[PDB]
Amino acid sequence: NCDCLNGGTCVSNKYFSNIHWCNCPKKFGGQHCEIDKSKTCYEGNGHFYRGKASTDTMGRPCLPWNSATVLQQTYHAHRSDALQLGLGKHNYCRNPDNRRRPWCYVQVGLKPLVQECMVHDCA
């Protein structure tokens, strides 16, 4: 694949014709450099936060974006724009609808509910 994010570079495969991969800067990982491995806070509203925070403000684990239950909600990993939104096979806090700060679905009794993430503002 290509479509390399976050300053990644599509490089061609050394042994195979017509294959490419993303060479990522060291702070990023993933097939598209889509995971920020080092960021510990969000900037602004965290609309483009891509770190690995995965706990809500009540100390509960976020549900994975590819869990059966999240797959039935508005925002999930099978969306056509899931890459651009940072929604993948992980349970990390995101902000696809431009709320005031990152959030994730959390299982609260019977239903998954949008809950704000524990992650702090870099400010």
UniProtKB/Swiss-Prot annotation:
It comes from the Eukaryota. Coiled coil: none annotated. Glycans are attached at residue 9. Disulfide bonds join 2-10, 4-22, 24-33, 41-122, 62-104, 93-117. Residues 1-34 form the EGF-like domain. Residues 5-28 are annotated as: Binds urokinase plasminogen activator surface receptor. Residues 41-122 form the Kringle domain. This is Urokinase-type plasminogen activator long chain A.
